[model samples]
Target chain A: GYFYNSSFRRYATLMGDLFSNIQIKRQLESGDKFIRVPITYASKEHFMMKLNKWTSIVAKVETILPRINLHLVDFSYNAPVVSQYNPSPIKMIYELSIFTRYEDDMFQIVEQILPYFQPHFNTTMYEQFGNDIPFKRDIKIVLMSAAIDEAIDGRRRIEWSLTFEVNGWMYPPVDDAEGLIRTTYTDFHANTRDLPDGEGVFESVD
Target chain B: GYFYNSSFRRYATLMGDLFSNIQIKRQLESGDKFIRVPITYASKEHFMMKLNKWTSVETILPRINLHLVDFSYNAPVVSQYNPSPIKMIYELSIFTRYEDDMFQIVEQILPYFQPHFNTTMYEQFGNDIPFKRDIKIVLMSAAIDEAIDGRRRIEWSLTFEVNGWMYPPVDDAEGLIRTTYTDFHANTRDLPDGEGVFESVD
Candidate 1:
C-alpha cells in the first residue's frame, strides 16, 4: 500500500537515459575526438565544488571537454480539463547546461540539437512492472535562454548554460476504489424552489 | 546448416501488417461508420472473380477492398564488389464501391507514402531488419464491369506501385579447386618465336 505513492523517479530516469545518448564529434589538430557527453542530475553546489577542485589540480592537464549537466528545476500542475470528472496534468521544467572549453565545439553541438526540437521529439519510457511496459512520451525541449561565459582567472573554462522548458505529462497511479450509490433517482434536481402561484402562473390568468 | 534463401514472404507480411492497421472513418446516412479496410494478398484474376460474384448478391452493396496484384524483380544488380542485392517492385490496388468514399480514403492514406517511408521487416525468417519503401500512384479509374446493372452501380479502382529492394544475406564459401605450377617461365617473344633475334636487321 505504501509503495503506490507519488514519485518523480521515473521521469528523472527517463530524461537521464534520453540525454546520455547524445553523441558529439569534434576535430582537433591531432585527430578526431568523438565524445559521448556525460549527463548527470547535478546540483549547483556539487557542480561548483567539482569544478573548483579541477581548477586546482597541478598534474592533470586537459582531462576532457563538453560536459553536460541536466537539472530538474521546477514542476507545476497545469491541468487540461474543463467541467469533467478526471485527474489534472502536470508540466515539468528542466535546465540543460552544456559546458565546453571551446566555443566552436559548443556551437556545433547546439546546431545539431536545435533542428530536432522543432516543437517536440518522441521518446519511449519503460515502466517497471512484472514485465517491462514501454510507453511513448512526447518531449518538448525548447531553448528558453542561452549564454556563453568567458573563461575567468580561477575557472579557466567557457561554459554555455541552456535553460529548457520541458513540457510533459505526469500520470498518477490508478486506485481500486469504488463509488457509493448516493441517490437512486436519476432525474432529481438539487436546491430547487417551487414557482410562485400567481406570478406568471396559469398563462398569466388573463 | 543455413544458406541465404529467396523468399519474399517476409516483405509481404510486413506490408500486410502495416496496411491492415490503417483505420478509416466516414459518416453515412445511418450513423458514423468506422471501417478497417480489408487487405488481402490476391492476384488480378482472383480479384475479378470475387468482384463478379459480389454483383449477384444484392445485399453486399457498398464496400472497399484492397489487393496486392503482383510482384516482379528487375535484375539490375546494384551491389558493389562481389555479392549482389536484388530489387523487386510490387503493385497494390484498392477497389471501392463509391467514388466519393474512395477519394476520401485515398486522401487520408497518401500523406504517409509521399517522400518515401522507412519501416522494419523480418529478414532471414525471424531477424528484424529495416527497409525503405518508395510508393507511386500509378492509375485511378472506373473498371468496365460485365454485370447487367452496368452504369447504375458504383465501382472504382486505384492502383499504386511500391519499388523496394530485397537484400538477402551474402555467404562465404571455399573455392572448389586450386591450381599450382612449378615452372617460372617468361614468354617474351612478341613476333611469333622466330623473328626477334636480329638487331638492326633492316
Candidate 2:
C-alpha cells in the first residue's frame, strides 16, 4: 500500500527527471556519439551487483560506460520550524552515485547539471489525498566525493565514480478549510479607556 | 508654485502620518498627560528663534521640543539607467528631547524602521497617485545643552536624519509615459572560420 502512492516516491521521481536527458557530442573523424544514461533504484550491494553483471557480460558487450544509482538514505523531522502553525520541517536525504568509464564524460555531465543548481533547486511534491495538494521545497545537492577504483594488479581502473548527497524538506500539510479561525469585531482603542482625565479632554478622534 | 507643493512638505506630512496613532502613558503623580507631539517645518535659525521666544515669555513653559532641521536635496539624475524616470536624494533631520519617558517613546517607534522603510508620498498636485519611496532613518548625533540661565532644566537631545529618494513619474510633453525596451530576439553561438572538418579529413 505504501508503494502504491507516497510522497517519497514522488520526490525520487522528481529527482530522476532532473537529470534524465540525452546528451550528444561529436568527434573530429568518428562523427558523433549519443549517450542515453538510465537511472536505477538500488543500494550499495545491489548497485555493485548490477555493475558486476554488466562487467561480466562479455558476449554482448562489456562495460556499460555511464550509469547512475539512486538510494533513499534517511528521513528525519528535527529541522527548525519557520512557521507558527506548521510543525518541525522534515529533512529527506538521498544519495546518488554516477559511474562512468571516462573521467571526461563524467565531468561533462557534472558541469551541465551543476549550473542548474547554484546552491539548490526548487521543486514541488504532491500529497496523496482525494485531491492532490502540492507543496514546494528547495533541494540542495552537494558533491560528497569523487574517486577512481584500483585493480588487484596494482594499476588504476578506468572507472570513475561520483557520489552526491541530496538534502531537501517535506512540510506538513495544511489543515482543511473547516479548521479555520474567525474573528468578528475588535476594539483597538479599548486599552486607552483607563485615562484618568475623563472623555472630554479630547473632543474628536482624528 | 514649485516651492508651494515641494517634497519637503510632503516628507514632513508623510512622517507625521506614519506616527499619528495616540501613544499614551501613565505618570505616578496627578493625572495622565496626553502626548500629542506636533511636527514643525522650520530651519535652524527659526528653531532657535522660537526657543528664545518661548524662553522670554514669563507665563509660558517649554514642555517638549521636536522639529525638523537641515532639509537639503541633491541634484536629480536618471535612476538605474532608465531614461524615463528621474531620482533626487533628500536628507532631513529630526530633533527630540532625551528623557527617560521620551526614550521609551523613541524605543517603541525605532523598531518599525530597522534600517529603512517604504512609504508612499504625493509629490505633484491634488490627492492623486502616490509614488513609493524608501526612507532610511538612523540616529546620527546627540548632545546635552546646559541652560545658560542656570534654570536647572538642562535639556538632552538626540538628532536623527532621514535619507530617501524622490522619484517623479515620467511624463512627456504630450502627457505620455515612457518605458524601457522589453522585446528583443537574440541568439548566441561559437564558430570557427576558414576551415571545415569534412573537407580536410575526407
Candidate 3:
C-alpha cells in the first residue's frame, strides 16, 4: 500500500462499488421509501456470528440482511512469462456475498449484477505511482460461479454467493533502482576530431 | 519471421547498426585505411551452425551474425491488467578468427546499455503505437574451435533482451460504467449490443 497503489486493495474496492449502491423498496411507516443496501469488506461467518440470530436491540429487532459482504479469497500467479525479472500475471478471486431477508430481494440484486459479466466484463483501472500518478489499464472480470445457501426453517434468510476471477498483473518494485543509459560517445581517434587533436587522423587516445 | 513487421527483426537490425560500423586495421601492404566489419541476420539455420564445417571464401568473416532465439510475451511491468510486455531475446554470434576483432566489436556495442539501452520503437498494428523499450545485452560466453590451421576458429555469443510494450486494440465505443444509481441508459450498458434489459427496473 505504501510503495505502490497495488491492485489487491483497489480491486476489492471496485467490487464493493459495483454492488453497494442498489436501492431496495420496502413497506415503511413513513410511506414508500427506497433504502440502499449496506456493504462491508467482511466475511459471512464473522458477520453472522456477530449478529446472533438477528436478536432484539432493546424493543425492535435489528437485521443486517439485505446487505453485502466483499472479500478477496485467492491470489496466484496466472501464467509464467519468459522471466523479465519483471512483472508476472496474477489471478485474483473476489467473492460478492449478498444477504437478504427474502429471495425476491436477492433476485433483484443478483439480476442487476449478473448481466454485465456475460462471463467477462472489461473495466478500466489505473496503476498508481507514488507521484499519485494514474496509468489507465483494462482488466477483465470473469464470473466463475454462483450458488445459494439452502433456506432452512427458522432462519428466514437467503444468502447468494457469487465468485469472480479477476485477470490482473503484479509488478516488481525493485527494477526502478537503476536509471537508463543515455547517449554514448566513442571517438575512434581518442578525440572529437573525427580524427584527433594529436594533430593527425591516425592518432589513438593521446 | 512468419508474419508481422515485428519487433524481433527490428531489434536485431538495431544491434547490427550499433556494432557493425566498427573499423579495424591490419598492417596492409597498401596504406592505412579503416574497414568496417560486416554483419548479417544469417537466415536462421545457415549462421550459428555453419561454424561446425569451417568453410572457405565468405569474406563475411570478422562478420556478425544476429539470430533471434526466443520471442515471448512478458507480463506488464506496472501491475495487473491488459497490454502485455513483449520480450524479444536474441543470441548474437560474432564470427571471426582473432580475439582482437571480437573484442573491439563487443566493446563498441556494449557502451549503450548500462547493460540496458532505452530505445524508442514505433510498434505497428492497426495503428502505429510509439513505445520506449529497454534493450539489455550481456556477454553470455565465447568459444574457439581447436582446428590447427583454423579457418573457422572463433565465435562469441551474446544474449540480448528487449523489454517492449504490446498494446491491445483501443475501444472506440463509449465508456461503460458499473456504478449507476440512476436509470440505465441504452449507451451505458456494459455489453452494448442492445440485448438485455435496456428498460428501467421499477
What TM-score does chain B alone reach in each candidate, compared with the true chain B?
Answer: 0.52, 0.50, 0.59
* Count of clashing residue pairs in every prediction: 0, 0, 3
lDDT of each: 0.43, 0.40, 0.50
Worst lDDT run of 10 residues, candidate 1 chain A, spans A180-189
List-wise, what DockQ does each model earn?
A: 0.00, 0.01, 0.01
Candidate 1: tens digits of C-alpha lDDT, residues B1-202: 4331323443443344444434344556785565666555655566557767656542343344445555666454465222233343444445555433443444344333322333322222233332223323222222322122322244434444444455544332421111111110111111111111111112
Model 3 agreement with the true structure over B1-202: per-residue lDDT tens digits: 1322333434455555545446555434574455577666654367545644446454546766666777787665654133466777766666666534543554445333333444443332343343333434443333322222313345556677766544543333422212111111112211111112111111
Query: Candidates sorted by TM-score, descending order?
Result: 3, 1, 2
Q: What is the lDDT of residue B199 in candidate 3?
A: 14
State model 2's lDDT.
Answer: 0.40
lDDT of 1: 0.43
In candidate 2, what fraction of native interface contacts survive? 0.00
Which one wins by TM-score: 1 or 3? 3
Tens-place lDDT digits, model 2, residues A1-206: 01212233444554555554525353557676666666665444456655665565344432355666655554433324132223224444556666665666667766766554445444332222333343333445555555555333222124444555555433322222223211111112112111111112211111
